[PDB]
């Protein structure tokens, strides 16, 4: 990757690429095709996991046919389905009530190591601490 | 260690003092112990800068007059009533 064009990332569904209320026609209409989003995206969706939000970026310009690309999940939402409280808070940020895990916050950051500048593998986990302490979640390390 | 330089005053009084003040100097005096009180002039500018610092008043200072170091502590200072200026200084021997 050296040059970019257009990109409209949005948490879509992997189970069935055919939304309407959330995305649907708003996921592609400026030269993008909604018929080419359920014949190629699903092809590379039955070889991993489908059901959780999957941000997608369509490489469409003006040549009709585009090139669907993949992405990665959010690290801030990684402490909800792989930690404890989904919300991550509950009350106004003033009284620490959240928590995490000392055994985790290391292997959950290795899954998204394709978007981490940290040269060292342990250097990428250092940035997770700050993202895992957004409100002040005290881990039991 | 603040080191002041000074000259002994030939003529003392009101007129003399005024004259001194006019010429960027100002009178001062040393007194303490058995020794007699020594009247001296001081260059004003040099001393004002020194006295800006709060360490000037607390610590011992060294007045050089006729090539002789007298160790004194600043006892009292007359300031001009509406200017950043010094009318006169009382030094006590130490």
């Amino acid at each position: 990757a050296k040059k970019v064009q257009a990109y409209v990332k949005l948490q879509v569904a992997a189970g069935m690429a055919n939304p309407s209320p959330p995305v649907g026609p708003a996921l592609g209409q400026q030269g993008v095709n909604i018929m080419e989003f359920c014949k190629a995206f699903n092809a590379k969706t039955d070889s991993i996991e489908k059901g959780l939000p999957i941000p997608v970026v369509i490489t469409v310009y003006a040549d009709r046919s585009f090139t669907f690309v993949t992405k990665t999940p959010p690290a801030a939402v990684l402490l909800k389905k792989a930690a404890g409280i989904k919300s991550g808070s509950g009350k106004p940020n003033k009284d620490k009530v959240g928590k995490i895990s000392r055994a985790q916050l290391q292997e959950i950051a290795q899954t998204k190591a394709a978007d981490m500048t940290g040269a060292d593998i342990e250097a990428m986990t250092r940035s997770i601490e700050g993202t895992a302490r957004s409100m002040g979640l005290v881990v039991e390390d | 260690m603040f080191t002041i330089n000074a000259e002994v005053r030939k003529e003392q009084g009101k007129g003399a003092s005024r004259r001194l003040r006019a010429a960027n100097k100002f009178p001062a005096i040393i007194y303490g112990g058995k020794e007699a009180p020594l009247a001296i002039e001081l260059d004003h500018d040099k001393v004002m800068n020194m006295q800006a610092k709060a360490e000037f008043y607390s610590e011992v200072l060294t007045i050089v007059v006729d090539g002789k170091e007298i160790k004194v502590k600043a006892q009292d200072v007359q300031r001009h009533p509406y200017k950043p200026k010094l009318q006169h200084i009382d030094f006590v021997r130490a």
């Binding site: 990757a1 050296k2 500048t117 040269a119 060292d120 250097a123 | -």
Partner: protein, 148 residues
């Protein structure tokens, strides 16, 4: 800027890499973006781990401050912006090659590949630093040169 107990740190790491290092490249980041250095991060990352550092130091009292010790020829490669890419474990690997392939994708520039200090020249993009572990190419002609 700090005082004198912070600027030396940069030179300390510079001299450390300049001295204790190997083949190094250059990347004149006149207008560094965000993916430009990000693309190099992965490239440098491949090399062992985090040993191929590439900071934006082109000052005479910064990257040129550690020239008197090792790499005593960076005085001509000290003007404008020169991102010295001092190496560490290994040797030349594919750093120079990768740099050339990464600088050929319009990634800013590199002052016409000024070059560091390794041989006895200056600017010379050589590809004789790539293979340095291959030892299975001499076992492909043994079960075909027996019948005849």
């Amino acid at each position: 800027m700090a005082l004198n107990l912070q600027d030396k740190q940069a030179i300390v790491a510079e001299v450390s890499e300049v001295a204790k290092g190997a083949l190094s490249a250059v990347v004149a980041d006149s207008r560094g973006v965000t993916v430009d250095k990000m693309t190099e991060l992965r490239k440098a990352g491949r090399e062992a781990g985090v040993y191929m550092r590439v900071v934006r130091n082109t000052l005479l009292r910064r990257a040129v401050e550690g020239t008197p010790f090792e790499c005593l020829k960076d005085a001509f490669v000290g003007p404008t912006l020169i991102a010295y890419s001092m190496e560490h474990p290994g040797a030349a690997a594919r750093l120079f090659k990768e740099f050339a392939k990464a600088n050929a994708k319009f990634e800013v520039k590199a002052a016409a590949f000024e070059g560091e200090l390794i041989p006895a020249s200056q600017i010379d993009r050589l590809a004789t630093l790539p293979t340095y572990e291959e030892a299975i190419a001499r076992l492909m002609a043994t079960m075909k040169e027996a019948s005849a």
